[PDB]
PDB file of C-alpha atoms in Angstrom:
ATOM      1  CA  UNK A   1     135.885  41.951  86.720  1.00  0.00           C
ATOM      2  CA  UNK A   2     132.096  42.118  86.951  1.00  0.00           C
ATOM      3  CA  UNK A   3     129.960  44.963  85.575  1.00  0.00           C
ATOM      4  CA  UNK A   4     126.757  46.412  87.016  1.00  0.00           C
ATOM      5  CA  UNK A   5     123.942  48.464  85.535  1.00  0.00           C
ATOM      6  CA  UNK A   6     120.634  49.923  86.676  1.00  0.00           C
ATOM      7  CA  UNK A   7     117.733  48.690  84.539  1.00  0.00           C
ATOM      8  CA  UNK A   8     114.221  50.167  84.465  1.00  0.00           C
ATOM      9  CA  UNK A   9     111.160  47.945  83.985  1.00  0.00           C
ATOM     10  CA  UNK A  10     111.553  47.910  80.210  1.00  0.00           C
ATOM     11  CA  UNK A  11     115.217  46.922  80.373  1.00  0.00           C
ATOM     12  CA  UNK A  12     114.452  44.180  82.915  1.00  0.00           C
ATOM     13  CA  UNK A  13     111.691  42.731  80.732  1.00  0.00           C
ATOM     14  CA  UNK A  14     113.901  42.810  77.614  1.00  0.00           C
ATOM     15  CA  UNK A  15     116.801  41.199  79.471  1.00  0.00           C
ATOM     16  CA  UNK A  16     114.568  38.403  80.705  1.00  0.00           C
ATOM     17  CA  UNK A  17     112.764  37.788  77.415  1.00  0.00           C
ATOM     18  CA  UNK A  18     115.955  38.059  75.413  1.00  0.00           C
ATOM     19  CA  UNK A  19     117.974  34.951  76.200  1.00  0.00           C
ATOM     20  CA  UNK A  20     116.338  31.540  76.145  1.00  0.00           C
ATOM     21  CA  UNK A  21     116.242  29.293  79.197  1.00  0.00           C
ATOM     22  CA  UNK A  22     116.496  31.905  81.942  1.00  0.00           C
ATOM     23  CA  UNK A  23     116.558  30.466  85.466  1.00  0.00           C
ATOM     24  CA  UNK A  24     114.345  31.684  88.316  1.00  0.00           C
ATOM     25  CA  UNK A  25     114.705  28.949  90.958  1.00  0.00           C
ATOM     26  CA  UNK A  26     117.209  28.787  93.803  1.00  0.00           C
ATOM     27  CA  UNK A  27     118.367  32.378  93.384  1.00  0.00           C
ATOM     28  CA  UNK A  28     119.677  34.862  95.984  1.00  0.00           C
ATOM     29  CA  UNK A  29     117.344  37.244  97.817  1.00  0.00           C
ATOM     30  CA  UNK A  30     116.074  39.967  95.508  1.00  0.00           C
ATOM     31  CA  UNK A  31     117.086  38.127  92.360  1.00  0.00           C
ATOM     32  CA  UNK A  32     114.436  37.869  89.660  1.00  0.00           C
ATOM     33  CA  UNK A  33     116.241  35.644  87.185  1.00  0.00           C
ATOM     34  CA  UNK A  34     119.665  34.432  86.102  1.00  0.00           C
ATOM     35  CA  UNK A  35     121.046  33.659  82.666  1.00  0.00           C
ATOM     36  CA  UNK A  36     123.723  31.055  81.988  1.00  0.00           C
ATOM     37  CA  UNK A  37     125.774  32.353  79.052  1.00  0.00           C
ATOM     38  CA  UNK A  38     129.246  31.489  77.668  1.00  0.00           C
ATOM     39  CA  UNK A  39     131.915  33.501  79.477  1.00  0.00           C
ATOM     40  CA  UNK A  40     129.229  35.493  81.305  1.00  0.00           C
ATOM     41  CA  UNK A  41     126.519  35.110  83.959  1.00  0.00           C
ATOM     42  CA  UNK A  42     123.651  37.600  84.209  1.00  0.00           C
ATOM     43  CA  UNK A  43     121.663  38.204  87.395  1.00  0.00           C
ATOM     44  CA  UNK A  44     118.812  40.721  87.675  1.00  0.00           C
ATOM     45  CA  UNK A  45     117.299  42.049  90.916  1.00  0.00           C
ATOM     46  CA  UNK A  46     113.999  43.634  92.021  1.00  0.00           C
ATOM     47  CA  UNK A  47     115.832  46.900  92.602  1.00  0.00           C
ATOM     48  CA  UNK A  48     116.671  46.965  88.909  1.00  0.00           C
ATOM     49  CA  UNK A  49     120.292  46.107  89.539  1.00  0.00           C
ATOM     50  CA  UNK A  50     121.768  43.769  86.965  1.00  0.00           C
ATOM     51  CA  UNK A  51     125.049  41.975  87.551  1.00  0.00           C
ATOM     52  CA  UNK A  52     127.319  40.655  84.788  1.00  0.00           C
ATOM     53  CA  UNK A  53     129.891  38.104  85.961  1.00  0.00           C
ATOM     54  CA  UNK A  54     132.476  36.381  83.799  1.00  0.00           C
ATOM     55  CA  UNK A  55     135.147  37.027  81.183  1.00  0.00           C
ATOM     56  CA  UNK A  56     132.694  38.503  78.668  1.00  0.00           C
ATOM     57  CA  UNK A  57     131.130  40.634  81.383  1.00  0.00           C
ATOM     58  CA  UNK A  58     132.027  43.995  79.853  1.00  0.00           C
ATOM     59  CA  UNK A  59     131.115  42.821  76.367  1.00  0.00           C
ATOM     60  CA  UNK A  60     127.730  41.516  77.478  1.00  0.00           C
ATOM     61  CA  UNK A  61     126.771  44.619  79.463  1.00  0.00           C
ATOM     62  CA  UNK A  62     127.619  46.926  76.566  1.00  0.00           C
ATOM     63  CA  UNK A  63     124.910  45.053  74.618  1.00  0.00           C
ATOM     64  CA  UNK A  64     122.243  46.677  76.781  1.00  0.00           C
ATOM     65  CA  UNK A  65     123.560  49.956  78.152  1.00  0.00           C
ATOM     66  CA  UNK A  66     126.329  52.404  77.393  1.00  0.00           C
ATOM     67  CA  UNK A  67     128.590  53.288  80.302  1.00  0.00           C
ATOM     68  CA  UNK A  68     128.669  49.885  81.973  1.00  0.00           C
ATOM     69  CA  UNK A  69     130.658  50.550  85.151  1.00  0.00           C
ATOM     70  CA  UNK A  70     132.943  47.963  86.766  1.00  0.00           C
ATOM     71  CA  UNK A  71     132.272  46.646  90.270  1.00  0.00           C
ATOM     72  CA  UNK A  72     133.725  44.236  92.835  1.00  0.00           C
ATOM     73  CA  UNK A  73     130.133  43.362  93.735  1.00  0.00           C
ATOM     74  CA  UNK A  74     129.043  39.723  93.349  1.00  0.00           C
ATOM     75  CA  UNK A  75     125.696  38.017  92.543  1.00  0.00           C
ATOM     76  CA  UNK A  76     124.686  37.596  96.189  1.00  0.00           C
ATOM     77  CA  UNK A  77     121.715  38.256  98.498  1.00  0.00           C
ATOM     78  CA  UNK A  78     120.385  41.833  98.585  1.00  0.00           C
ATOM     79  CA  UNK A  79     120.013  43.147 102.155  1.00  0.00           C
ATOM     80  CA  UNK A  80     116.918  45.089 101.110  1.00  0.00           C
ATOM     81  CA  UNK A  81     115.285  41.759 100.169  1.00  0.00           C
ATOM     82  CA  UNK A  82     116.318  39.526 103.081  1.00  0.00           C
ATOM     83  CA  UNK A  83     112.994  39.791 104.935  1.00  0.00           C
ATOM     84  CA  UNK A  84     110.802  39.571 101.829  1.00  0.00           C
ATOM     85  CA  UNK A  85     112.666  36.470 100.727  1.00  0.00           C
ATOM     86  CA  UNK A  86     111.780  34.770 104.053  1.00  0.00           C
ATOM     87  CA  UNK A  87     108.352  36.262 104.787  1.00  0.00           C
ATOM     88  CA  UNK A  88     106.936  36.556 101.285  1.00  0.00           C
ATOM     89  CA  UNK A  89     105.429  33.080 101.078  1.00  0.00           C
ATOM     90  CA  UNK A  90     104.413  32.692 104.729  1.00  0.00           C
ATOM     91  CA  UNK A  91     100.881  32.910 106.083  1.00  0.00           C
ATOM     92  CA  UNK A  92     101.033  36.310 107.787  1.00  0.00           C
ATOM     93  CA  UNK A  93      99.073  39.133 109.330  1.00  0.00           C
ATOM     94  CA  UNK A  94      99.707  42.576 107.890  1.00  0.00           C
ATOM     95  CA  UNK A  95      98.534  45.963 109.160  1.00  0.00           C
ATOM     96  CA  UNK A  96      98.393  49.592 107.993  1.00  0.00           C
ATOM     97  CA  UNK A  97      96.699  52.899 108.882  1.00  0.00           C
ATOM     98  CA  UNK A  98      95.066  55.793 107.032  1.00  0.00           C
ATOM     99  CA  UNK A  99      93.665  59.210 107.875  1.00  0.00           C
ATOM    100  CA  UNK A 100      96.536  60.437 110.035  1.00  0.00           C
ATOM    101  CA  UNK A 101      97.124  63.297 107.596  1.00  0.00           C
ATOM    102  CA  UNK A 102      93.452  64.073 106.963  1.00  0.00           C
ATOM    103  CA  UNK A 103      92.038  67.034 108.877  1.00  0.00           C
ATOM    104  CA  UNK A 104      88.531  65.553 108.667  1.00  0.00           C
ATOM    105  CA  UNK A 105      87.695  62.012 109.694  1.00  0.00           C
ATOM    106  CA  UNK A 106      89.384  59.396 111.849  1.00  0.00           C
ATOM    107  CA  UNK A 107      92.508  57.381 111.862  1.00  0.00           C
ATOM    108  CA  UNK A 108      91.745  53.905 110.590  1.00  0.00           C
ATOM    109  CA  UNK A 109      93.884  50.847 111.227  1.00  0.00           C
ATOM    110  CA  UNK A 110      93.264  47.541 109.481  1.00  0.00           C
ATOM    111  CA  UNK A 111      94.910  44.134 109.878  1.00  0.00           C
ATOM    112  CA  UNK A 112      94.555  41.317 107.371  1.00  0.00           C
ATOM    113  CA  UNK A 113      95.549  37.679 107.683  1.00  0.00           C
ATOM    114  CA  UNK A 114      96.491  36.042 104.376  1.00  0.00           C
ATOM    115  CA  UNK A 115      97.060  32.317 104.715  1.00  0.00           C
ATOM    116  CA  UNK A 116      99.490  30.649 102.299  1.00  0.00           C
ATOM    117  CA  UNK A 117      96.683  29.234 100.121  1.00  0.00           C
ATOM    118  CA  UNK A 118      95.266  32.715  99.611  1.00  0.00           C
ATOM    119  CA  UNK A 119      98.411  34.642  98.689  1.00  0.00           C
ATOM    120  CA  UNK A 120      98.113  34.137  94.916  1.00  0.00           C
ATOM    121  CA  UNK A 121      94.421  35.017  94.885  1.00  0.00           C
ATOM    122  CA  UNK A 122      94.954  38.280  96.764  1.00  0.00           C
ATOM    123  CA  UNK A 123      98.009  39.133  94.669  1.00  0.00           C
ATOM    124  CA  UNK A 124      95.943  38.479  91.534  1.00  0.00           C
ATOM    125  CA  UNK A 125      93.705  41.366  92.601  1.00  0.00           C
ATOM    126  CA  UNK A 126      96.519  43.733  91.665  1.00  0.00           C
ATOM    127  CA  UNK A 127      97.054  44.805  95.263  1.00  0.00           C
ATOM    128  CA  UNK A 128     100.600  45.819  94.282  1.00  0.00           C
ATOM    129  CA  UNK A 129     101.265  49.532  94.853  1.00  0.00           C
ATOM    130  CA  UNK A 130      97.882  50.058  96.496  1.00  0.00           C
ATOM    131  CA  UNK A 131      98.918  53.690  96.935  1.00  0.00           C
ATOM    132  CA  UNK A 132      98.509  54.356  93.220  1.00  0.00           C
ATOM    133  CA  UNK A 133      94.991  52.899  93.254  1.00  0.00           C
ATOM    134  CA  UNK A 134      92.228  55.527  93.186  1.00  0.00           C
ATOM    135  CA  UNK A 135      89.138  55.561  95.376  1.00  0.00           C
ATOM    136  CA  UNK A 136      87.083  53.811  92.687  1.00  0.00           C
ATOM    137  CA  UNK A 137      89.536  50.926  92.484  1.00  0.00           C
ATOM    138  CA  UNK A 138      89.541  50.675  96.279  1.00  0.00           C
ATOM    139  CA  UNK A 139      85.753  50.252  96.281  1.00  0.00           C
ATOM    140  CA  UNK A 140      85.973  47.363  93.809  1.00  0.00           C
ATOM    141  CA  UNK A 141      88.970  45.550  95.295  1.00  0.00           C
ATOM    142  CA  UNK A 142      88.399  45.978  99.023  1.00  0.00           C
ATOM    143  CA  UNK A 143      85.086  44.089  99.262  1.00  0.00           C
ATOM    144  CA  UNK A 144      86.618  41.192  97.291  1.00  0.00           C
ATOM    145  CA  UNK A 145      89.470  41.012  99.773  1.00  0.00           C
ATOM    146  CA  UNK A 146      87.260  41.284 102.835  1.00  0.00           C
ATOM    147  CA  UNK A 147      85.151  38.297 101.730  1.00  0.00           C
ATOM    148  CA  UNK A 148      88.181  36.147 100.925  1.00  0.00           C
ATOM    149  CA  UNK A 149      90.419  36.878 103.891  1.00  0.00           C
ATOM    150  CA  UNK A 150      89.775  37.439 107.604  1.00  0.00           C
ATOM    151  CA  UNK A 151      90.475  40.967 108.817  1.00  0.00           C
ATOM    152  CA  UNK A 152      90.063  43.291 111.756  1.00  0.00           C
ATOM    153  CA  UNK A 153      89.559  47.039 111.848  1.00  0.00           C
ATOM    154  CA  UNK A 154      89.829  49.722 114.525  1.00  0.00           C
ATOM    155  CA  UNK A 155      88.416  53.177 113.828  1.00  0.00           C
ATOM    156  CA  UNK A 156      89.501  56.211 115.870  1.00  0.00           C
ATOM    157  CA  UNK A 157      86.512  58.584 115.614  1.00  0.00           C
ATOM    158  CA  UNK A 158      87.130  62.334 115.896  1.00  0.00           C
ATOM    159  CA  UNK A 159      85.491  62.934 119.283  1.00  0.00           C
ATOM    160  CA  UNK A 160      87.693  60.258 120.854  1.00  0.00           C
ATOM    161  CA  UNK A 161      90.714  61.357 118.811  1.00  0.00           C
ATOM    162  CA  UNK A 162      90.353  64.926 120.095  1.00  0.00           C
ATOM    163  CA  UNK A 163      89.888  63.648 123.644  1.00  0.00           C
ATOM    164  CA  UNK A 164      93.123  61.621 123.596  1.00  0.00           C
ATOM    165  CA  UNK A 165      94.891  64.540 121.922  1.00  0.00           C
ATOM    166  CA  UNK A 166      93.879  67.227 124.393  1.00  0.00           C
ATOM    167  CA  UNK A 167      95.231  64.952 127.082  1.00  0.00           C
ATOM    168  CA  UNK A 168      98.679  64.892 125.538  1.00  0.00           C
ATOM    169  CA  UNK A 169      98.730  61.726 123.448  1.00  0.00           C
ATOM    170  CA  UNK A 170     100.725  62.280 120.226  1.00  0.00           C
ATOM    171  CA  UNK A 171      99.542  60.811 116.909  1.00  0.00           C
ATOM    172  CA  UNK A 172     102.408  58.347 117.054  1.00  0.00           C
ATOM    173  CA  UNK A 173     101.098  56.946 120.310  1.00  0.00           C
ATOM    174  CA  UNK A 174      97.628  56.802 118.789  1.00  0.00           C
ATOM    175  CA  UNK A 175      98.841  54.776 115.814  1.00  0.00           C
ATOM    176  CA  UNK A 176     100.797  52.348 117.994  1.00  0.00           C
ATOM    177  CA  UNK A 177      97.782  51.709 120.227  1.00  0.00           C
ATOM    178  CA  UNK A 178      95.433  51.272 117.274  1.00  0.00           C
ATOM    179  CA  UNK A 179      97.789  48.805 115.591  1.00  0.00           C
ATOM    180  CA  UNK A 180      98.221  46.797 118.768  1.00  0.00           C
ATOM    181  CA  UNK A 181      94.488  46.601 119.477  1.00  0.00           C
ATOM    182  CA  UNK A 182      93.659  45.699 115.866  1.00  0.00           C
ATOM    183  CA  UNK A 183      96.239  42.924 115.799  1.00  0.00           C
ATOM    184  CA  UNK A 184      94.749  41.651 119.071  1.00  0.00           C
ATOM    185  CA  UNK A 185      91.296  41.421 117.505  1.00  0.00           C
ATOM    186  CA  UNK A 186      92.530  39.512 114.449  1.00  0.00           C
ATOM    187  CA  UNK A 187      94.784  37.182 116.353  1.00  0.00           C
ATOM    188  CA  UNK A 188      91.856  36.206 118.571  1.00  0.00           C
ATOM    189  CA  UNK A 189      89.480  35.925 115.641  1.00  0.00           C
ATOM    190  CA  UNK A 190      91.664  33.471 113.687  1.00  0.00           C
ATOM    191  CA  UNK A 191      92.534  31.243 116.653  1.00  0.00           C
ATOM    192  CA  UNK A 192      93.102  28.282 116.998  1.00  0.00           C
ATOM    193  CA  UNK A 193      95.138  29.154 113.913  1.00  0.00           C
ATOM    194  CA  UNK A 194      98.286  31.192 114.475  1.00  0.00           C
ATOM    195  CA  UNK A 195     100.070  33.459 111.967  1.00  0.00           C
ATOM    196  CA  UNK A 196     103.588  32.485 110.888  1.00  0.00           C
ATOM    197  CA  UNK A 197     104.458  36.191 110.913  1.00  0.00           C
ATOM    198  CA  UNK A 198     102.894  39.527 111.856  1.00  0.00           C
ATOM    199  CA  UNK A 199     104.097  42.468 109.788  1.00  0.00           C
ATOM    200  CA  UNK A 200     103.796  46.151 110.692  1.00  0.00           C
ATOM    201  CA  UNK A 201     105.259  49.137 108.844  1.00  0.00           C
ATOM    202  CA  UNK A 202     108.138  50.840 110.631  1.00  0.00           C
ATOM    203  CA  UNK A 203     106.256  54.123 111.023  1.00  0.00           C
ATOM    204  CA  UNK A 204     108.457  54.431 114.097  1.00  0.00           C
ATOM    205  CA  UNK A 205     111.313  52.670 115.833  1.00  0.00           C
ATOM    206  CA  UNK A 206     110.357  49.211 117.078  1.00  0.00           C
ATOM    207  CA  UNK A 207     111.579  50.186 120.552  1.00  0.00           C
ATOM    208  CA  UNK A 208     109.400  53.330 120.553  1.00  0.00           C
ATOM    209  CA  UNK A 209     106.458  51.337 119.174  1.00  0.00           C
ATOM    210  CA  UNK A 210     106.309  48.857 122.059  1.00  0.00           C
ATOM    211  CA  UNK A 211     107.350  51.454 124.610  1.00  0.00           C
ATOM    212  CA  UNK A 212     104.046  53.184 123.751  1.00  0.00           C
ATOM    213  CA  UNK A 213     102.170  49.944 124.469  1.00  0.00           C
ATOM    214  CA  UNK A 214     103.607  49.849 127.994  1.00  0.00           C
ATOM    215  CA  UNK A 215     100.212  50.186 129.680  1.00  0.00           C
ATOM    216  CA  UNK A 216      98.341  47.983 127.214  1.00  0.00           C
ATOM    217  CA  UNK A 217      96.630  45.064 128.937  1.00  0.00           C
ATOM    218  CA  UNK A 218      97.494  42.873 125.949  1.00  0.00           C
ATOM    219  CA  UNK A 219     100.557  43.361 123.780  1.00  0.00           C
ATOM    220  CA  UNK A 220     101.233  41.389 120.626  1.00  0.00           C
ATOM    221  CA  UNK A 221     105.011  41.037 120.244  1.00  0.00           C
ATOM    222  CA  UNK A 222     105.521  37.377 119.356  1.00  0.00           C
ATOM    223  CA  UNK A 223     106.627  37.062 115.745  1.00  0.00           C
ATOM    224  CA  UNK A 224     106.002  40.770 115.114  1.00  0.00           C
ATOM    225  CA  UNK A 225     108.105  42.245 112.315  1.00  0.00           C
ATOM    226  CA  UNK A 226     108.572  46.018 111.918  1.00  0.00           C
ATOM    227  CA  UNK A 227     109.653  46.589 108.335  1.00  0.00           C
ATOM    228  CA  UNK A 228     109.937  49.679 106.072  1.00  0.00           C
ATOM    229  CA  UNK A 229     107.532  49.727 103.107  1.00  0.00           C
ATOM    230  CA  UNK A 230     106.163  46.453 104.427  1.00  0.00           C
ATOM    231  CA  UNK A 231     103.548  46.248 101.690  1.00  0.00           C
ATOM    232  CA  UNK A 232     106.424  45.077  99.499  1.00  0.00           C
ATOM    233  CA  UNK A 233     107.258  42.304 101.985  1.00  0.00           C
ATOM    234  CA  UNK A 234     103.905  40.534 102.133  1.00  0.00           C
ATOM    235  CA  UNK A 235     100.547  40.880 100.377  1.00  0.00           C
ATOM    236  CA  UNK A 236      98.717  40.896 103.712  1.00  0.00           C
ATOM    237  CA  UNK A 237     100.060  44.429 104.181  1.00  0.00           C
ATOM    238  CA  UNK A 238      98.798  45.723 100.838  1.00  0.00           C
ATOM    239  CA  UNK A 239      95.511  43.989 101.642  1.00  0.00           C
ATOM    240  CA  UNK A 240      95.365  45.811 104.977  1.00  0.00           C
ATOM    241  CA  UNK A 241      96.101  49.134 103.237  1.00  0.00           C
ATOM    242  CA  UNK A 242      93.252  48.671 100.773  1.00  0.00           C
ATOM    243  CA  UNK A 243      90.817  47.641 103.515  1.00  0.00           C
ATOM    244  CA  UNK A 244      91.820  50.609 105.704  1.00  0.00           C
ATOM    245  CA  UNK A 245      91.254  53.034 102.829  1.00  0.00           C
ATOM    246  CA  UNK A 246      87.875  51.452 102.025  1.00  0.00           C
ATOM    247  CA  UNK A 247      86.650  51.767 105.607  1.00  0.00           C
ATOM    248  CA  UNK A 248      87.989  55.332 105.770  1.00  0.00           C
ATOM    249  CA  UNK A 249      86.091  56.336 102.639  1.00  0.00           C
ATOM    250  CA  UNK A 250      83.011  54.727 104.200  1.00  0.00           C
ATOM    251  CA  UNK A 251      83.420  56.639 107.456  1.00  0.00           C
ATOM    252  CA  UNK A 252      83.877  59.859 105.533  1.00  0.00           C
ATOM    253  CA  UNK A 253      80.672  59.332 103.545  1.00  0.00           C
ATOM    254  CA  UNK A 254      78.775  58.763 106.776  1.00  0.00           C
ATOM    255  CA  UNK A 255      80.575  61.655 108.460  1.00  0.00           C
ATOM    256  CA  UNK A 256      79.849  64.058 105.587  1.00  0.00           C
ATOM    257  CA  UNK A 257      76.197  63.074 105.912  1.00  0.00           C
ATOM    258  CA  UNK A 258      76.062  63.658 109.669  1.00  0.00           C
ATOM    259  CA  UNK A 259      77.737  67.038 109.260  1.00  0.00           C
ATOM    260  CA  UNK A 260      75.658  67.900 106.220  1.00  0.00           C
ATOM    261  CA  UNK A 261      78.599  69.090 104.151  1.00  0.00           C
ATOM    262  CA  UNK A 262      80.993  67.236 101.839  1.00  0.00           C
ATOM    263  CA  UNK A 263      84.293  66.816 103.703  1.00  0.00           C
ATOM    264  CA  UNK A 264      87.349  66.962 101.409  1.00  0.00           C
ATOM    265  CA  UNK A 265      90.486  64.926 102.031  1.00  0.00           C
ATOM    266  CA  UNK A 266      93.831  66.259 103.230  1.00  0.00           C
ATOM    267  CA  UNK A 267      94.596  69.489 105.054  1.00  0.00           C
ATOM    268  CA  UNK A 268      94.856  71.923 102.151  1.00  0.00           C
ATOM    269  CA  UNK A 269      93.132  75.259 101.555  1.00  0.00           C
ATOM    270  CA  UNK A 270      89.814  73.649 100.552  1.00  0.00           C
ATOM    271  CA  UNK A 271      89.719  71.987 103.966  1.00  0.00           C
ATOM    272  CA  UNK A 272      90.019  75.340 105.765  1.00  0.00           C
ATOM    273  CA  UNK A 273      87.162  76.700 103.624  1.00  0.00           C
ATOM    274  CA  UNK A 274      85.013  73.630 104.359  1.00  0.00           C
ATOM    275  CA  UNK A 275      85.603  73.938 108.100  1.00  0.00           C
ATOM    276  CA  UNK A 276      84.693  77.632 107.914  1.00  0.00           C
ATOM    277  CA  UNK A 277      81.445  76.633 106.222  1.00  0.00           C
ATOM    278  CA  UNK A 278      80.785  74.103 108.966  1.00  0.00           C
ATOM    279  CA  UNK A 279      81.445  76.613 111.723  1.00  0.00           C
ATOM    280  CA  UNK A 280      78.962  79.029 110.141  1.00  0.00           C
ATOM    281  CA  UNK A 281      76.276  76.491 109.261  1.00  0.00           C
ATOM    282  CA  UNK A 282      76.384  74.085 112.229  1.00  0.00           C
ATOM    283  CA  UNK A 283      78.470  75.945 114.762  1.00  0.00           C
ATOM    284  CA  UNK A 284      82.067  75.609 115.892  1.00  0.00           C
ATOM    285  CA  UNK A 285      81.424  72.614 118.169  1.00  0.00           C
ATOM    286  CA  UNK A 286      80.457  70.551 115.149  1.00  0.00           C
ATOM    287  CA  UNK A 287      84.197  70.255 114.322  1.00  0.00           C
ATOM    288  CA  UNK A 288      84.752  68.227 117.466  1.00  0.00           C
ATOM    289  CA  UNK A 289      82.745  65.453 115.843  1.00  0.00           C
ATOM    290  CA  UNK A 290      84.436  65.504 112.437  1.00  0.00           C
ATOM    291  CA  UNK A 291      87.888  67.081 112.581  1.00  0.00           C
ATOM    292  CA  UNK A 292      91.263  66.693 114.255  1.00  0.00           C
ATOM    293  CA  UNK A 293      91.043  69.994 116.129  1.00  0.00           C
ATOM    294  CA  UNK A 294      94.683  70.408 117.098  1.00  0.00           C
ATOM    295  CA  UNK A 295      95.493  70.684 113.369  1.00  0.00           C
ATOM    296  CA  UNK A 296      96.476  74.161 112.111  1.00  0.00           C
ATOM    297  CA  UNK A 297      93.406  74.090 109.869  1.00  0.00           C
ATOM    298  CA  UNK A 298      91.190  74.833 112.866  1.00  0.00           C
ATOM    299  CA  UNK A 299      92.701  78.271 113.489  1.00  0.00           C
ATOM    300  CA  UNK A 300      92.694  79.096 109.785  1.00  0.00           C
ATOM    301  CA  UNK A 301      89.002  78.183 109.452  1.00  0.00           C
ATOM    302  CA  UNK A 302      88.033  80.183 112.537  1.00  0.00           C
ATOM    303  CA  UNK A 303      89.507  83.329 111.004  1.00  0.00           C
ATOM    304  CA  UNK A 304      87.750  82.828 107.691  1.00  0.00           C
ATOM    305  CA  UNK A 305      84.438  82.292 109.472  1.00  0.00           C
ATOM    306  CA  UNK A 306      84.687  85.558 111.433  1.00  0.00           C
ATOM    307  CA  UNK A 307      85.935  87.714 108.559  1.00  0.00           C
ATOM    308  CA  UNK A 308      82.402  87.705 107.128  1.00  0.00           C
TER     309      UNK A 308
END
């Protein structure tokens, strides 16, 4: 009977560093390392799952955690890691968007193509968990990525955003279109070369994604992979996220300057106050150039502006 446990980063590091001669090659999808011990085999996965197989399975597990539960589970491929295992080391294009939830500013979509020989370099930039990175880190990392790897960007300015919106196009359709047109730009820019894979986050069903591109004159579908939390599948995705955020910050700086008032991020109370200040200082129509009007924030700001 095998035993399983859930190990945090500290437990995984200890487990690996503990025994001598841990193996890392030819392992199942998701597996980090495997240890060949007498009467027991240890296998650790990205998810933190650690499998103990063998006669001394229960004895070995107890050496690390109390409450080692028994399982029929075997040291096999993890479904959550099947794509990453195959796509991880391929030269791929990755895309991501930003600004969809920001009342002020546009929606920015970026695509990045990381060729096999550039994977390590990009990864060395600490692109992992780009979400945690602050704006100052984005300004230092982004430019380094943009000069090392080819990329494409499509910016949906507010005036055009509002125009598509008042005609009935939902944000979802906006994102799909922006992704498709950005991938088109990058695919053409890197030709004759061709990406081994093209990864897009599953911000919506694949079927719905392409359905939205029905009228597109050019649709990139060949070798397109729609995966959840894709930035964990290939570095090109994390690269695209960082680039998108950098461009967004840039657009906001320029937008704040055109409007003449610092535009905060998000759609919280401060945003409503800011918009009220804009309405009073530059007029209501100024929002058409810098905000996503259909947002609830617009009505809230209008009230604040008229109250005094």
